[PDB]
Structure 1
Amino acid sequence: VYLDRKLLTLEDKELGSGNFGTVKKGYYQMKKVVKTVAVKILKNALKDELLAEANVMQQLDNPYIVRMIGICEAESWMLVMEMAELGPLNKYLQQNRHVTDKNIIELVHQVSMGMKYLEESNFVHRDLAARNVLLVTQHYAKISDFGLSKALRADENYYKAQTHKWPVKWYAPECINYYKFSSKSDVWSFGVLMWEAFSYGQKPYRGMKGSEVTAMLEKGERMGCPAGCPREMYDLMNLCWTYDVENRPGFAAVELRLRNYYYDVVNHH
């Protein structure tokens, strides 16, 4: 949707940055109330990527996915989104070390619900990481950052990339080796995201080059169990890290395992 620039107010507060430009906090006027927003502003191919990112967000409607308000064509191209005011999950857990395991399970289960919907909708995220999980509240997570997302063709269950700056530590072997991105590749990333969440926002494969990560994975080696991570949660991360794409579970199976485990945790102690 095309938004009116006069109805938008930008704050000095920078929420994010990259080659595209920045993300700033703002306020947008709705029919009656005013809405707090996060605005992706482009620096003045880069314009087309923003419109495709808006096109994907327009098509998604789920409680666990950041809602887009619209696009604003003014001093620059802007993508206006509802703000998840607690911000990225990795930074939040680095600053709040006392969040319980039950609370982490709850948040990771919400991400899996959002991804089950994306899988059902036949979109591939291609940038699933804890930095792209945003907190609305300490008990409500949403998936953001659809800049690399693709709508799958009607005849294929994967997107084939033509070019190769990629978040390689979050990518499945088939992505790195064959440039093929499927919902199962997003499951691998989700396993890295789970490790990050139970490691209170620690970076995965710390001190390792992307090429050293690839070699460790090719040898059947994986990151260890995070300190105090429940065994059932670590077993699920390893299942997400199944090398062969055909034996790796899809998001329906991942979400069901997280649902049953979470409702078992809440029913106990």
Structure 2
Amino acid sequence: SANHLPFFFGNITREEAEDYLVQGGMSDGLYLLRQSRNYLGGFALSVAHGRKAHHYTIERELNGTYAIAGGRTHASPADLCHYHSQESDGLVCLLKKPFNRPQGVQPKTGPFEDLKENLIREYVKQTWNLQGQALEQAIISQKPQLEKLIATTAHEKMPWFHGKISREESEQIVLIGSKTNGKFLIRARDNNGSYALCLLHEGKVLHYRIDKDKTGKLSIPEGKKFDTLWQLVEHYSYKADGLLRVLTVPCQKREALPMDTEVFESPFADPEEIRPKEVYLDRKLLTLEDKELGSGNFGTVKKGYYQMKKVVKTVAVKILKNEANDPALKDELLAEANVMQQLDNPYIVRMIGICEAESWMLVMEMAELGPLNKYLQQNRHVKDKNIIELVHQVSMGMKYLEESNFVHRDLAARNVLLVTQHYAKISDFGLSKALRAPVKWYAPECINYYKFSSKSDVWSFGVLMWEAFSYGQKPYRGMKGSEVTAMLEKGERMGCPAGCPREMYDLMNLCWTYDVENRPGFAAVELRLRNYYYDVVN
């Protein structure tokens, strides 16, 4: 807890924190503390310097201590702030003057805020019937979109809404049990937007009227206007305004979201569907379209249809080149295909199985919008926040591959395929290894020692992030491979793309760590990306 700190604001947005620093005059070293927007019990420090706001995630360590970017440990966020008032230790400047919560503003950390994580979890379970890893993977990518969604749900299902209870009933229900100050409920006074807010204050029930104006807005007499009871409760849980005190505990009574697609879950998630007993698929159940979707170094891709029990599944089929028919390649191709088929995550193009027919055929999930680099080059109106969402999903798919001890070897924007504008999937994982086989995407140890690992996939991910933020431009423009190797040895790197956030360019640079040992793994990359994504996207 940090509620005792007068400059601690709780769970506010990054923009609200910047608005407060502007309110405080934007002087160099002016700062405030807030809660990390990730449900991980961390904090965020917002500092003014050179007329810009600088934000840093404070992570809670396993032993209950706190640190920024794997840096030094601090006993508490107050102690971290004190240390940073004398030594920068990586921050833009020293912490000079705190911006205290204005008069009448309490930390945004009450029971209303606490309910959010479980509400989003319950919303995914109910809306999409997701469980286990599919459920956790939905939440991690879509937390900001899901928080916006739960705010629009009907007030009647909220724990603080008691419906058509009378004034006398509300009085008795607010008084039963422990007399927690701020204990409250909302009841309907009629069926035309008239409500009452009953609040416990030093053992007495206060009955406030909530009325709907001609413009459809809700308010208490002379109070701030709100479009919903959700917004009204959120506000009053940290700014009492016209109330005697804040609300606390409720009284006891092409643009689709990833989960809205048929490829979010595995085609075999339905227990009545027949999962193939091995890597092989029945060619008799597969139909290909005449026209190709494209081609590459390993084969041609066509749209296809795979006959299953309940439905016909639209698939993408990669028909491998004649070179893959060589008997010398067979065992490793089949061995890699088996391992590809084991992989199951929403952020990868799942490899359904293989057909040994006229040619070797890899049957995959369909990602109809095609590759990320070509999509961004054709759709330059795609916002920076949408690119962050897409690259974060790639870091999730890669975290899963790393956990599965699977090295991609060709991670690049051409190998990130879009199901929707808000749903990316990693494709062609392990294909270059399967076919016994791009230098601009290779880590220095790959070109020098042929050492491919999850760490060299991290390096590739940095180049991919650069491609994404550059709207599908080519990396190291016009340079030969030898010039790229020499430039990297000098410690030089590609520049920050136009409009690319500074935290995203710092993450690229971290992926481009020369030394393999010091380069982060995908767990660290995904978490750093997730923290930034959750702080900027509201």
TM-score by structure 1 length? Answer: 0.89
For the 8 Å contact 1:56–1:146, the answer to whether it is kept is: no
**How big is the shift at 1:50?**
4.0
**How big is the shift at 1:123?**
1.3
**How big is the shift at 1:47?**
4.5
**How big is the shift at 1:67?**
1.0
Question: Could you say what the CA RMSD is over the residues aligned between the two structures, in angstroms?
Answer: 2.2
> Residue 123 of structure 1: which of 406, 411, 420 is its match?
406
Of residues 3-12 and 124-133 in structure 1, the stretch that sits farther from structure 2 once superposed is: 3-12
**How big is the shift at 1:5?**
1.9
Tell me the secondary structure at the aligned position of residue 28 of structure 1. strand
1:148–1:28 distance in 2 versus 1, CA, 3 Å: closer
**How big is the shift at 1:149?**
6.3
RCO higher in 1 or 2 (8 Å CA, sep ≥ 6)? 1
Distance in 2 between residues matched to 1:178 and 1:259, nearest whole Å: 32
- Structure 1, residues 117-173: CA drift from partner, whole Å, max 9, x if none? 1111111111000000111111111111024466999xxxxxxxxxxxxx1100001
- Structure 1, residues 59-106: CA drift from partner, whole Å, max 9, x if none? 211111111221112222211111111111011101100000000000
For the 8 Å contact 1:192–1:204, the answer to whether it is kept is: yes
Percent identity over the alignment is: 100
**How big is the shift at 1:53?**
3.9
For the 8 Å contact 2:332–2:434, the answer to whether it is kept is: no
Aligned to 2:337: 54
For the 8 Å contact 1:53–1:146, the answer to whether it is kept is: no
For the 8 Å contact 2:299–2:319, the answer to whether it is kept is: yes
Tell me the secondary structure at the aligned position of residue 181 of structure 1. coil
**How big is the shift at 1:16?**
2.9
Is 1:99 the counterpart of 2:382? The answer is: yes
1:203–1:48 distance in 2 versus 1, CA, 3 Å: farther
1:176–1:262 distance in 2 versus 1, CA, 3 Å: same
Of residues 66-75 and 225-234 in structure 1, the stretch that sits farther from structure 2 once superposed is: 66-75
For the 8 Å contact 2:337–2:434, the answer to whether it is kept is: no
Is 1:12 the counterpart of 2:280? The answer is: no
Of residues 189-198 and 20-29 in structure 1, the stretch that sits farther from structure 2 once superposed is: 20-29
Which has more radius of gyration?
A: 2
Distance in 2 between residues matched to 1:263 and 1:152, nearest whole Å: 39
Distance in 2 between residues matched to 1:150 and 1:118, nearest whole Å: 15
For the 8 Å contact 2:463–2:475, the answer to whether it is kept is: yes
Is 1:263 the counterpart of 2:534? The answer is: yes
For the 8 Å contact 1:126–1:149, the answer to whether it is kept is: yes
Distance in 2 between residues matched to 1:22 and 1:96, nearest whole Å: 25
Distance in 2 between residues matched to 1:151 and 1:83, nearest whole Å: 21
**How big is the shift at 1:46?**
5.1
**How big is the shift at 1:6?**
2.4
For the 8 Å contact 1:20–1:46, the answer to whether it is kept is: no
**How big is the shift at 1:114?**
0.7
1:52–1:15 distance in 2 versus 1, CA, 3 Å: farther
Aligned to 2:519: 248
1:117–1:54 distance in 2 versus 1, CA, 3 Å: same
**How big is the shift at 1:23?**
1.2
- Structure 1, residues 197-254: CA drift from partner, whole Å, max 9, x if none? 0000001011011111001101111000000001110111011101111111111111
1:149–1:260 distance in 2 versus 1, CA, 3 Å: farther
For the 8 Å contact 1:89–1:130, the answer to whether it is kept is: yes
1:46–1:138 distance in 2 versus 1, CA, 3 Å: farther
For the 8 Å contact 1:42–1:77, the answer to whether it is kept is: yes
- Structure 1, residues 157-201: CA drift from partner, whole Å, max 9, x if none? xxxxxxxxxx11000011111111121111100000000000000
Distance in 1 between residues matched to 2:354 and 2:472, nearest whole Å: 31
Aligned to 2:422: 139
1:77–1:129 distance in 2 versus 1, CA, 3 Å: same
Please state which structure has a larger fraction of its residues in strand: 1
**How big is the shift at 1:7?**
1.9
Distance in 1 between residues matched to 2:432 and 2:454, nearest whole Å: 11
For the 8 Å contact 1:56–1:149, the answer to whether it is kept is: no
Distance in 2 between residues matched to 1:223 and 1:206, nearest whole Å: 10
**How big is the shift at 1:12?**
2.3
**How big is the shift at 1:48?**
4.6
Unpaired stretches in structure 1, ≥5 consecutive residues: 154-166
For the 8 Å contact 2:294–2:301, the answer to whether it is kept is: yes
1:151–1:250 distance in 2 versus 1, CA, 3 Å: farther
1:23–1:51 distance in 2 versus 1, CA, 3 Å: farther
**How big is the shift at 1:56?**
2.4
**How big is the shift at 1:19?**
4.5
For the 8 Å contact 1:89–1:133, the answer to whether it is kept is: yes
Aligned to 2:366: 83
1:53–1:38 distance in 2 versus 1, CA, 3 Å: farther
Unpaired stretches in structure 2, ≥5 consecutive residues: 1-278, 322-327
Tell me the secondary structure at the aligned position of residue 206 of structure 1. coil
Tell me the secondary structure at the aligned position of residue 150 of structure 1. helix
For the 8 Å contact 2:336–2:434, the answer to whether it is kept is: no
> Residue 65 of structure 1: which of 348, 360, 383 is its match?
348
Distance in 2 between residues matched to 1:90 and 1:253, nearest whole Å: 25
For the 8 Å contact 2:406–2:430, the answer to whether it is kept is: no
Of residues 242-251 and 6-15 in structure 1, the stretch that sits farther from structure 2 once superposed is: 6-15
Tell me the secondary structure at the aligned position of residue 149 of structure 1. helix
1:240–1:152 distance in 2 versus 1, CA, 3 Å: farther
**How big is the shift at 1:18?**
3.2
